[PDB]
Design a protein around this ligand. Structure first.
Ligand code: HEM
Length: 293
């Protein structure tokens, strides 16, 4: 019926092997710090990890992170993926150094590494994704539009099995990076520390005086006088009463937010994968910093 995607550990690799891929991505983050005006590639790696995981359809088990399908042209040239090709190019040299890691395993660890090296919470991660054939590549159109409202978001997230708490926890990833006109028809960052992982997104959403305006791509965005932005989907988080009390909780307690995000991000990343009972437990990688590097 629904595909079954069983996780299979890369033959003969253990924890230490994966700690090494992580340490390489980390060292590389540290080093190419000039990208996107000095934001670094942190934010674009997190976004690449969400986008390869977000094509998942809980109905027939297609899409999701398992197959590393982003490596194929169809997925790669998905208009909603515009701009991701920068996270790809960044990880290529790494893949060439550790050729035994599957794609989906690399693309997902990149997201975890970014968060943790950007001072986020530790995200437990699992190995085992296996590259599948070019024909298992999901058609374009499964990632969410940004010009919509809270019911649109609730609905969309439901296909990925995420509830309210998970959607608001994931969304605060919007503290990182920024929109770029050329990629999405949106322009501007969400906050000021856009390369440190904090609950900043929620404080802005609650504390700024936002104005609705149209941008040069002729799309509407919410503009703050501090120079921040909020897409319609972000904005929708304070329109809905269920979402807004959760926003508040997070504006109010960065810990809580970190715990909730950790859990939701892992789930997002393991959606669609069956892990045998004998599969190793999830790894918690040390940062560069905890390793003294
Ligand atoms: C309805 C849900 C979402 C919508 C409509 C949305 C839309 C967008 C758009 C339009 C951009 C800007 C692209 C560009 O021009 O570079 C963006 C960037 C980004 N997204 Fe979201 N996104 C959503 C959810 C997520 C989630 C769940 C995450 C991770 C949990 C995420 C992480 C990011 C990051 C980190 C960036 C910044 C990337 C950079 O600086 O290149 N977003 N998102």
């Amino acid at each position: 019926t629904p595909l079954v995607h069983v996780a299979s550990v890369e033959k003969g690799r253990s924890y230490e092997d994966f700690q090494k891929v992580y340490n390489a991505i980390a060292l590389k983050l540290r080093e190419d710090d000039e990208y996107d005006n000095y934001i670094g590639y942190g934010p674009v790696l997190v976004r690449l990890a969400w986008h390869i995981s977000g094509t998942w359809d809980k109905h027939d088990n297609t899409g999701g992170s398992y197959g590393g399908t982003y490596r194929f042209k169809k997925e790669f040239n998905d208009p909603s993926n515009a701009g991701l090709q920068n996270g790809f190019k960044f990880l290529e040299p790494i893949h060439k150094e550790f050729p035994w890691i599957s794609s989906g395993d690399l693309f997902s660890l990149g997201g975890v590494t970014a968060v943790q090296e950007m001072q986020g919470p530790k995200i437990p991660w699992r190995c085992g994704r296996v590259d599948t054939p070019e024909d298992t590549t999901p058609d374009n159109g499964r990632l969410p539009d940004a010009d919509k409202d809270a019911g649109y978001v609730r609905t969309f997230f439901q296909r990925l099995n995420m509830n309210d708490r998970e959607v608001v926890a994931l969304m605060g990833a919007h503290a990182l990076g920024k929109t770029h006109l050329k990629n999405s028809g949106y322009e501007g960052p969400w906050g000021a520390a856009n390369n440190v992982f904090t609950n900043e997104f929620y404080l802005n959403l609650l504390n700024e005086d936002w104005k609705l305006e149209k941008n040069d791509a002729n799309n509407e965005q919410w503009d703050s006088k501090s120079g921040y932005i909020m897409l319609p989907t972000d904005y929708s988080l304070i329109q809905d009463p269920k979402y807004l009390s959760i926003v508040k909780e997070y504006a109010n307690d960065q810990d809580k937010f970190f715990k909730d995000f950790s859990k939701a991000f892992e789930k997002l990343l393991e959606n669609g994968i069956t892990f045998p009972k004998d599969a190793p437990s999830p790894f918690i990688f040390k940062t560069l910093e905890e390793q003294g590097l």
